[PDB]
């Protein structure tokens, strides 16, 4: 049971390690998309203004 516990603990740890990496990636997608959104929200006003 200690062996199985250790194996499963490593699986949970390594799977959660990917979860936190994807959290940084998704956080980065938001950080970048927010910039593209900022630009888009100006081009739409320039288009309407022009």
């Amino acid at each position: 049971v200690e062996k199985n516990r250790k194996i499963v603990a490593e699986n949970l740890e390594k799977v959660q390690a990917e979860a936190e990496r994807l959290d940084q990636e998704e956080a980065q997608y938001q950080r970048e998309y927010s910039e593209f959104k900022r630009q888009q929200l100006e081009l739409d006003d320039e288009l309407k203004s022009v």
Binding site: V1, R5, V8, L12, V15, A19, L22
Partner: protein, 49 residues
Amino acid sequence: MEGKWITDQLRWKIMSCKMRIEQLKQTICKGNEEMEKNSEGLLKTKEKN
């Protein structure tokens, strides 16, 4: 005394072993419940991933 002293050593050995079986059975229950919880958590995390 040299007679009872020997049988009481055995009695203490049995009682000690029983106290250790009670401990190991609980240790396995604890280990299993921790593993079962960790397995359900891992499954949920894979699903989330």
